CSV table of C-alpha atoms in Angstrom, one decimal:
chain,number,residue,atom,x,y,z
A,24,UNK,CA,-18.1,14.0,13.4
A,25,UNK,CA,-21.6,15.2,13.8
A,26,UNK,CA,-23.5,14.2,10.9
A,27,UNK,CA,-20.4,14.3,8.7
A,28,UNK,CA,-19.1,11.1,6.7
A,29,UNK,CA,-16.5,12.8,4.2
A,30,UNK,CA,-13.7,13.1,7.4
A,31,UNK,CA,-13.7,9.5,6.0
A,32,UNK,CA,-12.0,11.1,2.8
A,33,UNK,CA,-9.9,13.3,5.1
A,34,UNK,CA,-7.7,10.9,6.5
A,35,UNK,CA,-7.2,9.0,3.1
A,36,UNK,CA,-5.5,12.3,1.8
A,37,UNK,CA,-3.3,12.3,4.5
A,38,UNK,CA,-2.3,8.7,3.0
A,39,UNK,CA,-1.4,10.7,0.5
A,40,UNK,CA,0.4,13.3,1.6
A,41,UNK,CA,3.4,10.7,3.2
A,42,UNK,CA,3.5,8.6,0.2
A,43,UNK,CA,4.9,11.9,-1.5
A,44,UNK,CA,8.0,11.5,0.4
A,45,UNK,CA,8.4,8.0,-0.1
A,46,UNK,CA,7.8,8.4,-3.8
A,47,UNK,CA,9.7,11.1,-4.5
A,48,UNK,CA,13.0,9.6,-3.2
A,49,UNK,CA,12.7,7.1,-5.8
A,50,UNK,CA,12.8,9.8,-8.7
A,51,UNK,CA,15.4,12.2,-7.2
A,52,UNK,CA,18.1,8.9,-6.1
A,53,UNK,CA,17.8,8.5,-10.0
A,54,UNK,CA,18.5,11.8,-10.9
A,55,UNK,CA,15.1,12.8,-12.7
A,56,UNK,CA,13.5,16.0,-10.8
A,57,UNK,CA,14.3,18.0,-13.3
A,58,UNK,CA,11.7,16.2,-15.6
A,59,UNK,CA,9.4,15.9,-12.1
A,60,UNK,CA,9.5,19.5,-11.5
A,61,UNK,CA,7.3,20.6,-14.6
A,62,UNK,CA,5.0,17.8,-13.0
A,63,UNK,CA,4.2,19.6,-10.1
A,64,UNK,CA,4.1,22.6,-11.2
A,65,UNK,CA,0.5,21.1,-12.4
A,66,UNK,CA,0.8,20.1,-16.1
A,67,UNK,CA,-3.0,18.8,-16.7
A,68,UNK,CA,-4.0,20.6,-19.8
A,69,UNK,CA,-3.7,17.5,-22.2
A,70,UNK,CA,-4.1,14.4,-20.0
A,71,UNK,CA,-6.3,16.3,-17.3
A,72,UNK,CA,-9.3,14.4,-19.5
A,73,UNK,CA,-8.1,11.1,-17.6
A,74,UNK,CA,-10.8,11.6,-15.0
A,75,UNK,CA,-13.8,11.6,-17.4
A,76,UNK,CA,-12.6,8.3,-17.9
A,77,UNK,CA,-13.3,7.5,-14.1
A,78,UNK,CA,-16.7,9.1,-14.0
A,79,UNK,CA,-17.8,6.3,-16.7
A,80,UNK,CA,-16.7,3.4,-14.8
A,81,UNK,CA,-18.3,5.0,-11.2
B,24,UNK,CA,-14.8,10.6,21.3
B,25,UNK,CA,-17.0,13.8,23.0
B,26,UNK,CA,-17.2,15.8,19.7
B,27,UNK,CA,-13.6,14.6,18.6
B,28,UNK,CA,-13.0,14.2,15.2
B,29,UNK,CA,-9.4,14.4,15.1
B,30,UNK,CA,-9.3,10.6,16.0
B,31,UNK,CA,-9.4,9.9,12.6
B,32,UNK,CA,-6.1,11.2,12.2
B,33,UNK,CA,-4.7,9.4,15.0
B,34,UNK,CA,-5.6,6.2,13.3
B,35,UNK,CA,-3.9,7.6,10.1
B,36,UNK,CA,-0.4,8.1,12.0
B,37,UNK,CA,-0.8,4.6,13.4
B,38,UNK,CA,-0.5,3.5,9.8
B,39,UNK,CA,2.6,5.4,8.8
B,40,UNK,CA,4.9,4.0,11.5
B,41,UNK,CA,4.0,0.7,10.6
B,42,UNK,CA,4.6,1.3,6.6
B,43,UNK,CA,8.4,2.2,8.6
B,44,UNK,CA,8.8,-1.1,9.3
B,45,UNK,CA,8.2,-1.7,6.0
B,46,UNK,CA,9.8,0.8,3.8
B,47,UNK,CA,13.2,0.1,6.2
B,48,UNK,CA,13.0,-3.5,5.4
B,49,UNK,CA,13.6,-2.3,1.7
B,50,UNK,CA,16.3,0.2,2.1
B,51,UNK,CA,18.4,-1.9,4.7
B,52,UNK,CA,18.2,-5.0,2.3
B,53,UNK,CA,20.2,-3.1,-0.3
B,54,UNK,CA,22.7,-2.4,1.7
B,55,UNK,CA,22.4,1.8,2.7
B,56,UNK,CA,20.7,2.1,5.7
B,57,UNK,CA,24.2,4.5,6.5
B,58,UNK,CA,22.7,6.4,4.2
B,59,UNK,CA,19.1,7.0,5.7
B,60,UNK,CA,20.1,6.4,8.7
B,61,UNK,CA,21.2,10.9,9.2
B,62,UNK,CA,17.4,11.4,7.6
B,63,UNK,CA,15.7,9.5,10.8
B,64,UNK,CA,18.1,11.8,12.8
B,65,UNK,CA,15.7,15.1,10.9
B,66,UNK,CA,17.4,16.4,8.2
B,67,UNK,CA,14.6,18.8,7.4
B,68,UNK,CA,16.6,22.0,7.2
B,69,UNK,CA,16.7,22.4,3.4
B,70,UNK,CA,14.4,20.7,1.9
B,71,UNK,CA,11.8,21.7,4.8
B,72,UNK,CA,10.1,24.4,2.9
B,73,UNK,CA,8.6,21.7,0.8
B,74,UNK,CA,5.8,21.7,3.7
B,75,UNK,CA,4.8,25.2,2.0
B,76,UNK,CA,4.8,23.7,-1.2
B,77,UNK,CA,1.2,21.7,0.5
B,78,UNK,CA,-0.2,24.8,2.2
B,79,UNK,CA,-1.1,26.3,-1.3
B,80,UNK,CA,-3.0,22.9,-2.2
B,81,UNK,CA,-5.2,23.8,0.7
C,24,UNK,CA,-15.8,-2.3,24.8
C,25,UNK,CA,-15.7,-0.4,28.3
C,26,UNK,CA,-13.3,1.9,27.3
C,27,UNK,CA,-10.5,0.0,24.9
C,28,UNK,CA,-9.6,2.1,23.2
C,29,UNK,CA,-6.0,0.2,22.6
C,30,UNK,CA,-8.3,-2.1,20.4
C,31,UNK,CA,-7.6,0.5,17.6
C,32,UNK,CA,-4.3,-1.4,17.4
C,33,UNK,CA,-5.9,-4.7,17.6
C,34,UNK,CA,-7.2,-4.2,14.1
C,35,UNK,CA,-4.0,-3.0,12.7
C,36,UNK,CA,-1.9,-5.9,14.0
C,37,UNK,CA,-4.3,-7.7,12.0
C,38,UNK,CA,-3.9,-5.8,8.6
C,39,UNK,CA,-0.2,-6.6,9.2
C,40,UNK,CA,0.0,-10.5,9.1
C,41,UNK,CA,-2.1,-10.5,6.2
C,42,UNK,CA,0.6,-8.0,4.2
C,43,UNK,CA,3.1,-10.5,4.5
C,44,UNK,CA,1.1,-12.6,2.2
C,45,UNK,CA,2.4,-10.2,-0.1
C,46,UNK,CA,5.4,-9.3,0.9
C,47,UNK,CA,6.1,-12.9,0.7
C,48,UNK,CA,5.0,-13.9,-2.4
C,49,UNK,CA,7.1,-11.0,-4.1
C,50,UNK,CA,10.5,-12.1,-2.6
C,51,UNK,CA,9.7,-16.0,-3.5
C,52,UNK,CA,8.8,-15.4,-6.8
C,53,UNK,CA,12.3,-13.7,-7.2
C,54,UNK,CA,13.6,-16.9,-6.2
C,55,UNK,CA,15.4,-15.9,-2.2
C,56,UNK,CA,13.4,-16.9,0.2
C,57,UNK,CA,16.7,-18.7,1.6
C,58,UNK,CA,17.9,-15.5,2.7
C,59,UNK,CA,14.9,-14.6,4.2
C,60,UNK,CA,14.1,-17.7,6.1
C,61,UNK,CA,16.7,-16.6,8.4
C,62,UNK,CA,14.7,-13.4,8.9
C,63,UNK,CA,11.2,-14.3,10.1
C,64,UNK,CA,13.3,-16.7,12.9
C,65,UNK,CA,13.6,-13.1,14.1
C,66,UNK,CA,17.8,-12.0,13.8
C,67,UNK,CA,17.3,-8.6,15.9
C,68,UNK,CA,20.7,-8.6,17.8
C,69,UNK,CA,22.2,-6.2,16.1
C,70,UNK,CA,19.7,-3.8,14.0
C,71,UNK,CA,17.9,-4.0,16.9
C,72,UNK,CA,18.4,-0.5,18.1
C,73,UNK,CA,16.6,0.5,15.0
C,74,UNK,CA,13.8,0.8,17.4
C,75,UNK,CA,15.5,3.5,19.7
C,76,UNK,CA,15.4,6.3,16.6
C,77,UNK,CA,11.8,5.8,16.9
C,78,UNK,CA,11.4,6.7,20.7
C,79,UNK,CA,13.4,10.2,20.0
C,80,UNK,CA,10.6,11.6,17.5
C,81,UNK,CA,7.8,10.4,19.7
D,24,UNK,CA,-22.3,-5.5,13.0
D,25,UNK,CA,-23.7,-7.0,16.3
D,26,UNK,CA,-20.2,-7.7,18.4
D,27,UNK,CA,-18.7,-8.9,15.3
D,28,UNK,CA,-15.0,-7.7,15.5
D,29,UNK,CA,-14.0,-10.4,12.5
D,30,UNK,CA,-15.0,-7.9,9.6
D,31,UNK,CA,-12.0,-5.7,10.2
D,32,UNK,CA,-10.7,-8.6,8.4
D,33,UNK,CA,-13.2,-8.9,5.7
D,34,UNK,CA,-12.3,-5.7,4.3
D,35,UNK,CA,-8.7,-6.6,4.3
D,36,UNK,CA,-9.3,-9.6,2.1
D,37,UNK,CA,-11.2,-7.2,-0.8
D,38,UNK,CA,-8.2,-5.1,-0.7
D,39,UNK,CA,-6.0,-8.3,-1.8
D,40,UNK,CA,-8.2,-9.2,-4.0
D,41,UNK,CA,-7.6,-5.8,-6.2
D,42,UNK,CA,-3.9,-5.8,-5.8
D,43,UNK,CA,-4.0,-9.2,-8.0
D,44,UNK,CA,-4.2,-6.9,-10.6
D,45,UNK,CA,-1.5,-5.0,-10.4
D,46,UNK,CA,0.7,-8.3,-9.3
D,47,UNK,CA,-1.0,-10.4,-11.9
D,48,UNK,CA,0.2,-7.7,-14.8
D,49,UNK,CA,4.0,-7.2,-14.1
D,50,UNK,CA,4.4,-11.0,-14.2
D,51,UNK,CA,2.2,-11.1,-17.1
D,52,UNK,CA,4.0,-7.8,-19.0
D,53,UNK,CA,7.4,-9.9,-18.7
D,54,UNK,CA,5.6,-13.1,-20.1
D,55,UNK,CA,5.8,-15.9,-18.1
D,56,UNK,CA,2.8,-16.5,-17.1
D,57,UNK,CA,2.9,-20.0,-17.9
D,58,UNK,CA,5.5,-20.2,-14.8
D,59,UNK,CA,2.6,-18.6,-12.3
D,60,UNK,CA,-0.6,-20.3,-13.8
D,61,UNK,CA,0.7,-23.8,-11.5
D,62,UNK,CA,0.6,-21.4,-8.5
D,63,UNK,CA,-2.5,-19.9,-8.5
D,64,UNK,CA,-3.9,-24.2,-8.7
D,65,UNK,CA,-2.5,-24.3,-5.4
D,66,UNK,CA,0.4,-25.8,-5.2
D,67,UNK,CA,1.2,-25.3,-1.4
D,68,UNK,CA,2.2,-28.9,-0.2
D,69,UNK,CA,6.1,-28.7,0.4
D,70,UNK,CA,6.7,-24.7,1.3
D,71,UNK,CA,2.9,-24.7,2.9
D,72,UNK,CA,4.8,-25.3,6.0
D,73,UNK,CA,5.6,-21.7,5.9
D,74,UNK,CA,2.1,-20.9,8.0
D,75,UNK,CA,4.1,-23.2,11.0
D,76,UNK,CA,6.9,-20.0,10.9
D,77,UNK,CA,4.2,-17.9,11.9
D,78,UNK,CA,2.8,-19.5,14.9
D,79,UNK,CA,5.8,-18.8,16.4
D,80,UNK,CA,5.8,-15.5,16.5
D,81,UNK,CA,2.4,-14.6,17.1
E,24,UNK,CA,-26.0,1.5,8.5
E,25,UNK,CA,-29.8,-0.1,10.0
E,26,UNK,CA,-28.8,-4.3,9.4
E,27,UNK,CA,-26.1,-3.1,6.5
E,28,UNK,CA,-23.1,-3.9,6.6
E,29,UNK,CA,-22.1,-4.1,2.6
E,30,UNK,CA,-21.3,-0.4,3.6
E,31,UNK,CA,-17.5,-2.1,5.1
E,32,UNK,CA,-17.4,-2.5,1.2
E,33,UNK,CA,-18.1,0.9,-0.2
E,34,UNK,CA,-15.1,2.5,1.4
E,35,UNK,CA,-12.8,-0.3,-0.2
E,36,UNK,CA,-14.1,1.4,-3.3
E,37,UNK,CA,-12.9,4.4,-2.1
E,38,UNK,CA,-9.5,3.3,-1.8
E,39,UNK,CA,-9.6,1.8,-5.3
E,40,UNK,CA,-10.3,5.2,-7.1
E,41,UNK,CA,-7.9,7.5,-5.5
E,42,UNK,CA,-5.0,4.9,-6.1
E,43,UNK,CA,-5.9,5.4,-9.7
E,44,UNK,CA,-4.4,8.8,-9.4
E,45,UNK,CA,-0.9,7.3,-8.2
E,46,UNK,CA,-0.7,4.1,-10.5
E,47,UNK,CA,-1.6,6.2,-13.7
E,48,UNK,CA,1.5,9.3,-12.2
E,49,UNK,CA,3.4,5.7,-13.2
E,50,UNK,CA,2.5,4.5,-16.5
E,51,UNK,CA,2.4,8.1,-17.4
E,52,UNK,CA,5.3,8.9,-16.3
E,53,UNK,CA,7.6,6.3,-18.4
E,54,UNK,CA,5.3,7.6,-21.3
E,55,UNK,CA,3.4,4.9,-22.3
E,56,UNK,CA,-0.3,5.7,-21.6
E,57,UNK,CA,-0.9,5.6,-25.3
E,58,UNK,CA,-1.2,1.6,-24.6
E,59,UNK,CA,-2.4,2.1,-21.0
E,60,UNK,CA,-6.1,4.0,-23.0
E,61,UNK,CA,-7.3,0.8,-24.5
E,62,UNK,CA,-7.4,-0.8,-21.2
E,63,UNK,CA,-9.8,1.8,-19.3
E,64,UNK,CA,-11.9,1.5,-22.2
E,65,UNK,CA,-12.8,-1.9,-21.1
E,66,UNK,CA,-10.6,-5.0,-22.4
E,67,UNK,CA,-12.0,-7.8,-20.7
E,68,UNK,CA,-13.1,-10.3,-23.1
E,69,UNK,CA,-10.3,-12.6,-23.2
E,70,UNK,CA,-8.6,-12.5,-19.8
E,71,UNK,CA,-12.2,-11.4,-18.5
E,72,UNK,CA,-12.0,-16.0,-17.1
E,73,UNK,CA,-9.4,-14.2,-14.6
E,74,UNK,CA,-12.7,-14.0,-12.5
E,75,UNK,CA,-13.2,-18.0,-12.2
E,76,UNK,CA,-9.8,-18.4,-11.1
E,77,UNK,CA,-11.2,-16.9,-7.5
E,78,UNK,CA,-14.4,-18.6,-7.6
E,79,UNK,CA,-12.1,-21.6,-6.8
E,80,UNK,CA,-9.8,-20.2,-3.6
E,81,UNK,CA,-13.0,-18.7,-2.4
């Protein structure tokens, strides 16, 4: 808290920490983990360019 | 507030028992709140281990 | 501001009464806001002890 | 920022403002918005009284 | 922060980017960000009058 701002950005990944659980009770009371999984597991090889699209805007 | 930081998390689980009243509002209206009702009781036994699943993020 | 800190509350009561805005126009736009009237003239006789399971984890 | 408690609120209000892009294309995807361009000219003069169930409350 | 207080504003933006990484886990997740691309690439020129409609309520 001295000096420091990005706590700011802290507590907003807590935010999303417990939307994870709300989330993900969605896709496993529909019976789709299986195709979640691979998700997870970090699959952003061909889509991972999605945030050079953010940097344009901001 | 003496060199605290860790407020800002306090303000952060203020907002997740108030998305409860929320979410609940949701699952109740469809008629399954017998359902949830066990997982408010803790039901992390199982499916606890997904907490690890965080600690390797950070 | 000598020492309130239970004002912290004060502003989240107030990002609360603005959500139902939402809420609201979700549930009226689906055509049911007969079944929800009944609701918001608060029918907390029953699901009341909902409340209860929330003393137990804090 | 001189003892001015009401901007809690103003920051509220620019998060509603943003979420009427997300609303505005789901009733837009499903075409009809020909049914929701008549509510966005106001057309709060026989459920407006809905602002009365609120009084009651708080 | 000296007599500014279009900083309340700035971490609304903050809020707006990051929920960028849920909505798009959506779209991309029913496979369908192949129509999703043309809109990040800036598509307002038609329903770009959606702007007006909230120089009226406000």
């Amino acid at each position: 808290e001295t000096g420091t701002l990005i706590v700011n950005s802290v507590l907003l990944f807590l935010a999303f920490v417990v939307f994870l659980l709300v989330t993900l009770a969605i896709l496993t009371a529909l019976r789709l983990a299986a195709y979640a999984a691979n998700i997870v597991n970090v699959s952003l090889v061909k889509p991972t360019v999605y945030v050079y699209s953010r940097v344009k805007n901001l």
